[PDB]
Amino acid sequence: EVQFLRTDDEVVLQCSATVLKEQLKLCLAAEGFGNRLCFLEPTSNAQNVPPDLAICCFTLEQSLSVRALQEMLANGHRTLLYGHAILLRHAHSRMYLSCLTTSRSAFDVGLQEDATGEACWWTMHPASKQRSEGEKVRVGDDLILVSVSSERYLHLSTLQVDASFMQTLWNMNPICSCCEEGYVTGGHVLRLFHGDECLTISAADSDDQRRLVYYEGGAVCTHARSLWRLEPLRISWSGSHLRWGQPLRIRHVTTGRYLALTEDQGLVVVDACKAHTKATSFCFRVSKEKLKRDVEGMGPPEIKYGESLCFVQHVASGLWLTYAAKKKAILHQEGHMDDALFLTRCQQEESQAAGMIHSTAGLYNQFIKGLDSFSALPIEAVILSLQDLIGYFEPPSEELQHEEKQSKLRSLRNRQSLFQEEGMLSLVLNCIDRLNVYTTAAHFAAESWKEIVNLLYELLASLIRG
């Protein structure tokens, strides 16, 4: 059986390289908020360390002919045909893949806010005499991608990506496609509920050190700390319908860590580097009674948001996710009778906010550590991140209509809360305090220190403004 790519499918763009004499598959990645520049994410070492592949997801928003493109610029899911121009939306940041007027050392390739220009479109061509112009792009076909804007091939420099004149063969791998409505698929951000209670880790700056998992009720069910993203041990078709007993990792979104059984502490959350399969592989079980070769495609729908009750089991151990009797989660031999959980899907707005908090927090801890050493600096990214977060929290125009503004106001106040609860006020203050140890702009040595500090404060007010 063979599958074609249709518009509205989700895909990773994958290339290969022999590194240390060993072949390594890497996927096209980017951040969006904080950084627009594309980079490469290795997926070869997935069994030992999970790739951050939310950053690697691209939605095939459009596929047009040269004639259809030229016409649309002046002014039902389609199948991808060779010689077509495509529009790729970064699933994470909602930004489009495009080749940029800048160059760093051939152009640079990254993301742009709108799909307005010709920069964000790419025509796909056969990498072989095996395929013709106008023929359906098959899943697994080695292909070439030229930029409509620069007439240049997307390629891996040698590791990073650029719009060079030297070609590289790419693989478009399906993440997902049209799915059965209401069913859980991989890549989804969700909450795991127990009856008001949901599965969660502690709040920012806790003695917990954010390593332990709990069952908690109340406000948590509306906070980012209770969000988890489900990840299968697949690279291709990881966004297929989840199946009972199918092994998957459970990633905490804001923290980035992975739910794991550990030899020393039992059930904890664990850093990506330490998330080997045996430790971090879980599944959903219909029951606790004692006990399938994977398909290609969306597969059978088995788990339904809200209606399905699932017992969580650590695969390697067969232990049951359960509570101790806010109560602490543990993995246990027998578990409890009421261990069954149900899954509730997180909505886009609340979800990307949690994704932003994750990357922002990582970027700023990067900023913190370097200054600790002197007791590089990601300045371009930091001031970009800052300026982006400020636009994010920018109050709606006073000139906008009142009825819609009140709703837009609730959105802002919600975003702020999500950020505040994850200790972002503290984070920003932690940076402000670090920089103000230095007593001057020229005392620094450094050029944009005045702006980097200046912007941190501007965000602070934006995080507080009612």
Swiss-Prot record:
Residue stretches making up the MIR domain: 77-127, 134-175, 181-233, 239-298, 300-347
Q: In which tissues is it expressed?
A: Detected in skeletal muscle (at protein level). Fast- or slow-twitch skeletal muscle.
PTM notes? The N-terminus is blocked.
Q: Where in the cell is it found?
A: Sarcoplasmic reticulum membrane
Summarize the protein's role. Answer: Cytosolic calcium-activated calcium channel that mediates the release of Ca(2+) from the sarcoplasmic reticulum into the cytosol and thereby plays a key role in triggering muscle contraction following depolarization of T-tubules. Repeated very high-level exercise increases the open probability of the channel and leads to Ca(2+) leaking into the cytoplasm. Can also mediate the release of Ca(2+) from intracellular stores in neurons, and may thereby promote prolonged Ca(2+) signaling in the brain. Required for normal embryonic development of muscle fibers and skeletal muscle.
- Further facts: Binding of [3H]ryanodine indicates that the heterozygous channel is activated by Ca(2+) concentrations 4-fold lower than normal. Single-cell analysis of cotransfected cells shows a significantly increased resting cytoplasmic Ca(2+) level and a significantly reduced luminal Ca(2+) level.
**Hey, which family's this protein in?**
Belongs to the ryanodine receptor (TC 1.A.3.1) family. RYR1 subfamily.
Outline the subunit composition: Homotetramer. Can also form heterotetramers with RYR2. Identified in a complex composed of RYR1, PDE4D, PKA, FKBP1A and protein phosphatase 1 (PP1). Repeated very high-level exercise decreases interaction with PDE4D and protein phosphatase 1 (PP1). Interacts with CALM; CALM with bound calcium inhibits the RYR1 channel activity. Interacts with S100A1. Interacts with FKBP1A; this stabilizes the closed conformation of the channel. Interacts with CACNA1S; interaction with CACNA1S is important for activation of the RYR1 channel. Interacts with CACNB1.
Q: Domain remarks in the entry?
A: The calcium release channel activity resides in the C-terminal region while the remaining part of the protein constitutes the 'foot' structure spanning the junctional gap between the sarcoplasmic reticulum (SR) and the T-tubule. Pore opening is mediated via the cytoplasmic calcium-binding domains that mediate a small rotation of the channel-forming transmembrane regions that then leads to channel opening.
> What is the name attached to this protein's record?
Ryanodine receptor 1
Its source organism is Oryctolagus cuniculus (Rabbit)
Gene, per the UniProt record: RYR1
